[PDB]
Design a protein around this ligand. Structure first.
Ligand SMILES: [N-]=[N+]=NCC(=O)N1CCC(c2nc(-c3cccs3)no2)CC1
Ligand SMILES: [N-]=[N+]=NCC(=O)N1CCC(c2nc(-c3cccs3)no2)CC1
Lengths: 194, 194
């Protein structure tokens, strides 16, 4: 029963590797999950609702990993601190590229998907700004731009850059260079007097 | 004749302020342009082709303005140099918000629109990287990240951040704070040793 929902989710993630949600049928999902097409509809109203659940699980997985870092002290240099945080997102989204990609596209056509992404981006921006404010408070970083504004542009950069890399977009930073690229830009803009 | 094509283009830009391309009909465009619906089809195959032409004109307008800066010496401090260049894009795209917004959305559904955007982004990245290399060559900026990689992430940040601002997205940087935000991040990451 609960195993049937998990089998629907696992099947959808697998097939999204191969083709867009547009070219996946409910029949495909039902067949991969070992249930009938009418039984599918007991668990989800649509293939679009299945993608929303997949995206929700990934975004929460990233959020929980970030909470684990936040809870620790972690004796570290400032560049390494930011690197480990950025790495949470690079690894979580990069381990679920097909779901990431389909999820980003569905933001244009789905109000629920648009809202889910917006909600977590707001949360992740507020935490970034809180960390920058703390750095400023102990005299480790200079009082330059408004911290929330700085944090917003840095996060939108990470969104656009990570996803362009994962999709093999033209133009993009090579996947093997993206972490180093983002970390340099974060560290210089947060600690730089100019 | 050539005035009829320009009237079709002017009408489309105006109506895009009010509503998405989805809710604009060929009848609307033909009526605003003072021609019949069959006469429209002499000039364009579709309302989608009209948007492509509008986007092409805007992107070329930005590109030409950047060329004018490139051609000058312009006796300036380094922060002011980058500011005037970033301002080209903030002002050009920000003077054509409806076309910008519709154009960005059409990248998902139109190969021609996707290609046009990709082509100009590549050009703008290559010029950014050439300027950073020149700065490094005269000893004004440190040899840190590969310049083309640095230039790619900085440009993708500007894309995502400008367009989120213009659309009133949640999250976004206020339109009145976006130029200062981007300039700080560009200057510190290009000139910062760390
Ligand atoms: N795009 N996107 N995803 C969001 C994204 O890329 N982020 C980068 C790291 C940010 C951050 N790291 C940290 C800490 C690291 C170590 C201790 S706290 N605090 O905020 C969280 C959001
Ligand atoms: N997104 N987007 N649009 C692209 C964008 O935002 N750009 C920012 C400025 C870049 C640039 N400026 C300059 C110069 C300024 C002054 C002399 S050269 N050279 O490269 C060009 C591309």
């Amino acid at each position: 029963g609960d195993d049937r929902e998990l089998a629907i989710l696992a099947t959808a993630e697998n097939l999204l590797e191969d083709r867009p949600l547009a070219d996946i049928s409910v029949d495909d999902l039902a067949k991969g999950a070992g249930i009938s097409r009418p039984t599918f509809y007991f668990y989800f109203p649509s293939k679009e609702a299945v993608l929303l659940t997949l995206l929700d699980r990934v975004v929460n997985q990233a959020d929980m990993a970030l909470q684990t870092l936040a809870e620790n002290p972690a004796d570290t240099d400032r560049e390494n601190m930011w690197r480990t945080g950025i790495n949470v997102f690079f690894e979580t989204f990069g381990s679920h590229k097909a779901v990431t990609r389909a999820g980003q596209a569905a933001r244009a056509t789905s109000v629920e998907v648009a809202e889910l992404w917006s909600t977590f981006m707001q949360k992740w921006i507020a935490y970034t700004a809180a960390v920058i404010d703390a750095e400023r408070d102990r005299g480790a970083a200079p009082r330059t731009l408004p911290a929330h504004e700085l944090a917003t542009a840095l996060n939108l950069m990470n969104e656009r850059t990570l996803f362009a890399s994962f999709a093999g977009e033209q133009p993009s930073v090579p996947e093997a260079r993206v972490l180093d690229t983002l970390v340099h830009i974060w560290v210089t803009s947060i600690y730089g007097e100019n």
